[PDB]
Structure 1
Amino acid sequence: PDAVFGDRVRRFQEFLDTFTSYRDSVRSIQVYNSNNAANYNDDLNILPHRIIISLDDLREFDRSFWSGILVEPAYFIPPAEKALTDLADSMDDVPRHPWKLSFKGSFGAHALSPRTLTAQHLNKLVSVEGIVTKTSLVRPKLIRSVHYAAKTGRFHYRDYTDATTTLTTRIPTPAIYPTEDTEGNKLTTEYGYSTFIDHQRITVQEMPEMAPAGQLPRSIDVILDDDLVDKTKPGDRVNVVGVFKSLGAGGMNQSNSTLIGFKTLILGNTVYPLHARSTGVAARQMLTDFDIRNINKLSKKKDIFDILSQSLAPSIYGHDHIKKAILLMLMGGVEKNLENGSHLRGDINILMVGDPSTAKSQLLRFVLNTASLAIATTGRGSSGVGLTAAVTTDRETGERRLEAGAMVLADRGVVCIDEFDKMTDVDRVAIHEVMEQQTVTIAKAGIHTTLNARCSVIAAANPVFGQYDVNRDPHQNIALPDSLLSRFDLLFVVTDDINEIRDRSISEHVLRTHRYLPPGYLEGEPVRERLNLSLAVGGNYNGTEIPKLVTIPFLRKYVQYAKERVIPQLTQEAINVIVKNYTDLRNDDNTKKSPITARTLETLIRLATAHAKVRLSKTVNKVDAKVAANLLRFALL
């Protein structure tokens, strides 16, 4: 026993007794485990034994212990973990794995980068943001092996440790695997009674958004244990909190004799998958009770569809029906999975074609910014393997693996395509399967598999003549195959028609839009750009908490609540309207921009279903069918 260890344990007891949030978090974890065990006993998931600790509260409580965790974590983290384990066992007497710790908050000079990490940060708690490039296979590691002696009929065990599982270096005692007891009898390995802990290696590289534009990137290795494995996939932006530790002897023994140096890695304590723009991590926002009541207060208004639509991009004048379509795409319909395995779409796809400089690219960038999992692509820039999938070779196993393109990474999200008309033909054939069957089927040399690509596609295209002509039929104007148009639920032709009063409205809107300052900014001070990273859990300027126009951060919460909560179902009053309008549209004599196929019918359903998500109604009513019908009619006529 060590005196300073006990003193730090008592200090963390005082810190945990001061802030009861950690105490009832321990309570909530233990009661969840107990009710799951009781439900398994009578009639499931087990939460890990770790607690998120705020560094700011610790700094407010004890500066010395906070600086001890940050600077010398090997001497301060194990006393805190023992204190948390003792606190957990204090209240667990009435109802075995030791409790771990994780850290959030400001790290100061310890919030670093894979490039910025040098040897002065060794043996220190660092928070490193970056991008996951390599993720090793989750491998079990033997901790305690259990053996059986049949001659004497007794069970033995042996514990195994390495330098990774401990923060403080001890004497390395390699205990061999026992195949024979002390008396000489043969032992049988009792698999199922031995304990194995999941181990993972990930490689965190600096983000390409914050990296120098021509230099080779720097990377670090992070070790993860049982509760922290499988929290990342390659391509994620991450924040890893952990101890930067050196291991072994850097060639200073006789046997090693080389200049790898001391091997350096991070013992991961906390993994936060950060949301970034056009990445694979979906943005999630915590819904408080006040925000839920606000969302339910919006849902009861009759004008609800026209506030959320007009509150999309208030800095773009007009294009209101496109705002409605984008909102309904963000809601996303209901996906049907039939009992025989056949699949029906829920996602809404929007194509916009028309004259240059008509807020098409800006609307695509808005969808990239405001959607949870939007990924931006351009026409020529990405190819058939770029959007769907490709094959690469593993270094360790030696077998081929897959790399996920834009459609696979944007599963349950939005793909924002700019310059849609400049796709190659093979890319277009790749798009045909994704837009309808919602899957990517790849049959390469030895690899045959289907990936889920359930995406909503919003696309911007230009006419082949550079401008839309009213007198010429749309077949030569858009000049796109009818299969592709049938894939798109809503096709919008945007025309830059010149009118005096319209141009005056454009000028006044833009000039009032260019006269804005953020709060806390001076008149001549230039606006600073901060890169947007959000933690993923689980023309009027003065829009603040629904005065007339809804804020974008509250629009995101409304969309998240609607997608997670309500799954509306059709009823006969909507079906009659949908059937009548589809029959009228199929047999109308009017020329239309898009051909009317069977897909249009389901389009109506999806659109109606999307409107039912706007109202937070479990039922799809007649008004939803009518607003779907007249949004479709404007796009067609």
Structure 2
Amino acid sequence: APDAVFGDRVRRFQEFLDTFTSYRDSVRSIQVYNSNNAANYNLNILPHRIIISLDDLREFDRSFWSGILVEPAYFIPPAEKALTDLADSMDDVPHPNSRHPWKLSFKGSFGAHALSPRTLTAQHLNKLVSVEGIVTKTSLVRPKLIRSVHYAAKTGRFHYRDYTDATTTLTTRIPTPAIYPTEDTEGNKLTTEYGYSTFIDHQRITVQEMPEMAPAGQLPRSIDVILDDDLVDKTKPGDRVNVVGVFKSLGAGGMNQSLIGFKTLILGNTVYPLHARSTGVAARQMLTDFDIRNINKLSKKKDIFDILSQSLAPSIYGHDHIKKAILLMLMGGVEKNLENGSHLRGDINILMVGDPSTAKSQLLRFVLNTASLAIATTGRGSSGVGLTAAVTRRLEAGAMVLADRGVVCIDEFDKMTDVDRVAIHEVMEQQTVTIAKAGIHTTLNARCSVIAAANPVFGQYDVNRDPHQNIALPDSLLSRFDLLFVVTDDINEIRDRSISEHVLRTHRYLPPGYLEGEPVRERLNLSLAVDHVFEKFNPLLIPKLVTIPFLRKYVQYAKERVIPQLTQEAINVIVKNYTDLRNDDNTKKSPITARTLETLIRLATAHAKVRLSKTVNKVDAKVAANLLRFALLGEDI
């Protein structure tokens, strides 16, 4: 039976949708997208879901906003009905072959409802809450029968029955346990018609307080979240997540005479995978047309490589070719997948062996902070079980499996066991992890670029000795590292005063919105995995330095929209340089193998990607070989 208050709220939300035109634009775009590939194929179908900004709702109608936040069961169904009515009103051109219920998702500032699994108590029940946590368990995506269609052969007629549970609606119904129809009303045997029955995907994930904010030494708190038909498979275990949903109570909690307390869970409305450092979530960024224009504008510059090289770690003094190599690894080459099935690696590995305090770990931490997807590990702090996969009858991804299509920053690389070393041997060239353990023969993808830091045998790189004795690493392992940089802390007066002036200038830095003696606050930077190009603060005083967010945008653009093709004019340089490096006797820091030809190719491709060029020209090969010759010998030609 119709409710006057329900209709009043429906028309109020219709007024809200009319006021903010972005929601008709979103619904219209979704409908035209669905119709266009429906007619095209007689890709994927976008869900009937709209992101609603709670700030705009508060601006429009504060009580509707407070009603949704505090009494969602009475305000969300009317708003969803209004959205569905609006969508069916604009649906003048129906999809080929009210109706099509549209769901709502919420975003914005939740205030006191933005909680965690620890702070989510029983006085938040029946409220729209945003819970931030870590996904620890993801159940199987199971179909749920919401409508069963049967066939009666004697009458030749198709019947159906709709099913309802306590979690499909925000309000409580009268429970109607309608049985599965095994026969008609008048005795005819029914045959279930699979493919005409309706099954809805259902998942139940567990969100636990994030380790970065959970109290140390205390047992963590968890909360159940239920996802239905479009939020399933939106996250994976170990993901940082922000789930917006209604904190519901279900069952009777032992009152109904046939539990210790009422069964509580979150009916998920929105799932946002969050980006935290050293996690398995990549960093999607929004690239406006202005950002792309600036990226192309800077790519037109000749010295853009240098501009990108110095802007990586201005705080670190020097380490300029190391920064060039780090930028090239951030871009990386393009992997080759030949038709027969073979794989050519397109990821660049870097090793930095050096004396104490030459900033190898700060250069690792910077890469961890700025990379799209980076996992930080330490030698012997993570084993092969912790680096590669692990069998739990089920597999748990390790450091280098979560970092697939990403970067692995390994500090204290020398303090790594040989059992880990063999797994690392497999991961670096073939980019795969073969388990073959306890009846689980699986080949996980570990297409990751490894950057590592190491110390010499005696703790100080002796220039009198040779590198092979100063490294104490297997030669086969050192071959996998595309670029091996030996950094030595030479005491020279010019660079001594220059590095000290830099260190002090960096220490004498103030944020734009801070006082002289105000302790700088620090948050954990839980970015959402979806305004000037250059940097005001320049530790060096000189070319221009771009901001780290803009550098990340540039790296993302070049990494996702540029796939350079090798050219003969680059091949001549690459082949000549490889032949010289193989045959010339120079007492190289690292050996020269066919892997050296491919690090030449990969670095040339990466530098071509830096310039946004779709073809690797001669200059790219020359600069790649230049960096390689520096890395092998120390030349400055």
**Shorter-chain TM-score category?**
over 0.9
| Mapped contact 1:332–1:346 kept (Cα < 8 A) | yes
Structure 1 residues 560 and 11, CA gap change in structure 2 (3 angstroms): same
- Post-superposition Cα deviations, 1:566-617, rounded to whole Å, max 9, x if no partner, equal 0000010000000000000000111010000110000000000000111000
Distance 1:476 1:626 in 2: 31
List aligned pairs for 1:19-58, cutoff 5 A: 19-41=20-42, 44-58=43-57
Does residue 452 of structure 1 match 2:452? no
What secondary structure sits across from 1:227 in the alignment? coil
Task: Verify the 8 A CA contact 2:502 2:539 in the aligned structure 1.
Answer: no
Distance 2:542 2:157 in 1: 71
Shift of 1:259: 4.3
User: What secondary structure is seen at the aligned counterpart in 1 of 2:442?
Assistant: strand
Measured after TM superposition, the shift of residue 306 of structure 1 is 0.2
**Where do 5+ consecutive residues of structure 1 fail to align?**
392-399
Matched residues in 1 for 2:111 and 2:278: separation? 28
For the residues of structure 2 that align with 1:245 and 1:542, how far apart are their CA atoms? 52
The Cα offsets for residues 118-149 of structure 1, whole Å up to 9 and x where unpaired, read as 01100000000000000000000000000000
Partner residue, 1:311 = 311
1:437-461 Cα distance to aligned partner (Å, 9 max, x none): 0000011111111000000000000
Aligned partners of 2:314 and 2:538 also within 8 Å: no
Q: Could you give the per-residue CA deviations for residues 229-249 of structure 1, whole angstroms, max 9, x where no partner exists?
A: 000100000000000000010
The 1-side partners of 2:585 and 2:517 are apart by 59
The equivalent residue for 1:73 is 72
Identity value in percent:
99
2:597 corresponding residue in structure 1: 601
C-alpha deviations, 1:450-504, integer Å up to 9, x for none? 0000000000000011000111111100111111111000000000000111100
2:256 and 2:263 map into 1 onto residues whose CA distance is: 15
Aligned mates of 2:440, 2:418 — CA distance in 1: 23
Rounded to whole Å, the distance in 2 between the matches of 1:63 and 1:207 is 32
CA distance in 2, matches of 1:129, 1:202: 13
Contact 1:543 1:550 in 2 (8 A): no
Residues 72 and 124, structure 1, Cα contact 8 Å, conserved in 2: yes
The 1:545–1:176 alpha-carbon spacing in structure 2 relative to 1, beyond 3 Å, is farther
Q: Deviations over 1:52-77 (max 9, x none)?
A: 00000000000000000000000000
Alpha-carbon separation, structure 1, partners of 2:275 and 2:352: 28
| C-alpha separation in 2, matches of 1:68 and 1:547 | 55
CA shift for structure 1 position 390 = 0.6
Write the distance in 2 (CA, Å) between the matches of 1:544 and 1:358: 18
Q: 1 CA distance for matches of 2:324 and 2:265? A: 50
Note the alpha carbon deviations across 1:358-384, whole angstroms, 9 max, x for none. 100000000000001100000011101
Aligned-pair distance for 1:260? 3.0
| TM-aligned CA distance change 1:293 to 1:598, over 3 Å | same
The whole-number CA distance in structure 2 between the counterparts of 1:267 and 1:6 is 24
Among candidates 598, 613, 619, match of residue 615 of structure 2: 619
> Alpha carbons of 1:228 and 1:544: their partners in 2 closer, same or farther (altered >3 Å)?
farther
Change (3 A) 1:546 1:447: farther
Q: Does structure 2 conserve the Cα–Cα contact (< 8 Å) formed by 1:355 and 1:463? A: yes
TM-score (norm 2): 0.96
State the Cα distance separating 1:545 from its structure 2 match: 18
Alpha-carbon shift at residue 544 of structure 1 (Å): 15
Q: Return the offset for 1:81.
A: 0.2
Distance 1:542 1:322, change over 3 A: closer
The answer to whether the 8 Å contact 1:336/1:345 transfers is yes
Deviation at 1:548, TM superposition (A): 1.5
Distance 2:464 2:22 in 1: 69
Check whether the contact 1:543–1:551 (CA below 8 A) recurs between aligned residues. Answer: no
CA–CA distance in structure 1, aligned partners of residues 171 and 256 of structure 2: 21
Cα 1:135–1:493 shift into 2, 3 Å: same
Aligned partner of 2:87 in structure 1 is 88
Aligned with 1:269: secondary structure? strand
Verify the 8 A CA contact 1:179 1:187 in the aligned structure 2.
yes
Q: By how many angstroms is 1:253 displaced?
A: 1.6
2:506–2:539 contact (8 Å) kept in structure 1: no
Change (3 A) 1:544 1:629: closer
Q: Could you say if the C-alpha distance between residues 355 and 544 of structure 1 is closer, same or farther in structure 2, counting changes exceeding 3 Å?
A: closer
How many pairs are equivalent?
A: 621
Q: Show CA shifts across 1:180-216 (max 9, x none).
A: 1111100000000000000000000000000100100
Q: Give CA deviations for 1:291-321 in whole Å, capped at 9, x if unaligned.
A: 0000000110001100001000000000000
- Matched residues in 1 for 2:538 and 2:433: separation? 45
Deviation of 1:542 after TM superposition, in Å, equals 5.5
Inter-partner Cα distance in structure 1 for 2:455 and 2:558: 33
Residue 434 of structure 1 aligns to a residue whose secondary structure is helix
Q: For residue 66 of structure 2, give the secondary structure of its aligned residue in structure 1.
A: helix
Instruction: Deviation per CA, 1:22-43: give whole Å up to 9, x if none.
Output: 10100000000000111012xx
State the Cα deviation string for residues 317-336 of structure 1 (Å, max 9, x = none).
00000000000000011000
Q: Does the Cα contact within 8 Å between 1:544 and 1:551 map onto a contact in 2?
A: no
SS in structure 1 at match of 2:271? strand
Kept after mapping to 1: 8 A contact 2:562/2:614: yes
Question: Contact conserved, 2:314 with 2:540, CA < 8 A, in 1?
Answer: no
Change (3 A) 1:545 1:271: farther
2: CA distance between counterparts of 1:387 and 1:629? 32
Residues 547 and 356 (structure 1 numbering): CA distance in 2 closer, same or farther, change over 3 Å? Answer: closer
Q: What do the CA deviations read for 1:531-575 (whole angstroms, capped 9, x no partner)?
A: 1111111xx715999992100000000000001100000010000
Distance in 1 between residues matched to 2:505 and 2:80, nearest whole Å = 57
Give, in angstroms, the shift of residue 97 of structure 1: 2.3
* Larger mean Cα displacement after TM superposition, 547-556 or 295-304: 547-556
Asked whether the 8 Å contact 2:388–2:397 carries over to 1, the reply is yes
Q: Which residues in structure 2 correspond to 1:189-588 (within 5 Å)?
A: 189-254=192-257, 259-391=259-391, 400-537=393-530, 541=537, 548-588=544-584
Aligned partners of 2:563, 2:185: CA distance in 1, in Å? Answer: 65
| Change over 3 Å in CA distance of 1:546–1:292 after alignment to 2 | farther
Alpha carbons of structure 1 residues 423 and 37: separation in structure 2 relative to 1, 3 Å: same
CA contact (8 A) 2:505 2:539 kept: no
Assess if the C-alpha contact under 8 Å between 1:574 and 1:621 holds in 2: yes
SS at match of 1:421: coil
Assess if the C-alpha contact under 8 Å between 1:379 and 1:421 holds in 2: yes
1:357–1:546: structure 2 CA closer, same or farther, 3 Å change rule? closer
- 3-state SS of paired residue (2:414): helix
TM-score, structure 1 normalization? 0.96
Deviations 1:76-105 (A, max 9, x none): 0000000000000001133x4200000000
Give the distance between the partners of 1:334 and 1:259, measured in 2 at CA.
57
Task: Report the CA distance shift for 1:267/1:525 in structure 2 as closer, same or farther (over 3 A).
Answer: same
1:386-435, Cα deviation, whole Å (9 max, x unpaired): 100111xxxxxxxx100000010000000000000011111000000000
Partner of 1:394: none
Shift in Å at residue 528 of structure 1? 0.6
Q: Distance in 1 between matches of 2:632 and 2:422?
A: 25
- Counterpart-to-counterpart distance in 1, 2:412 and 2:539: 33
Unpaired stretches in structure 2, ≥5 consecutive residues: 94-98, 531-535
SS in 2 for 1:9: helix
Distance 2:567 2:493 in 1: 47
Is contact 2:356–2:455 with CA below 8 Å preserved after alignment? yes
Measured in 2, the distance between the counterparts of 1:78 and 1:586 equals 72
Task: Kindly indicate whether the alpha-carbon contact (under 8 Å) linking 1:544 and 1:550 is maintained by their aligned counterparts in 2.
Answer: no
Aligned pair in 2 of structure 1 residues 125, 292: CA closer, same or farther (>3 Å)?
same
Go from structure 1 to structure 2 and tell me whether the alpha carbon gap of 1:548 and 1:268 turns closer, same or farther (over 3 Å shift). same
C-alpha distance in structure 2 between counterparts of 1:15 and 1:522, whole Å: 42
Check whether the contact 1:378–1:417 (CA below 8 A) recurs between aligned residues: yes
Counterpart CA distance in 2 for 1:10 and 1:621 is 62
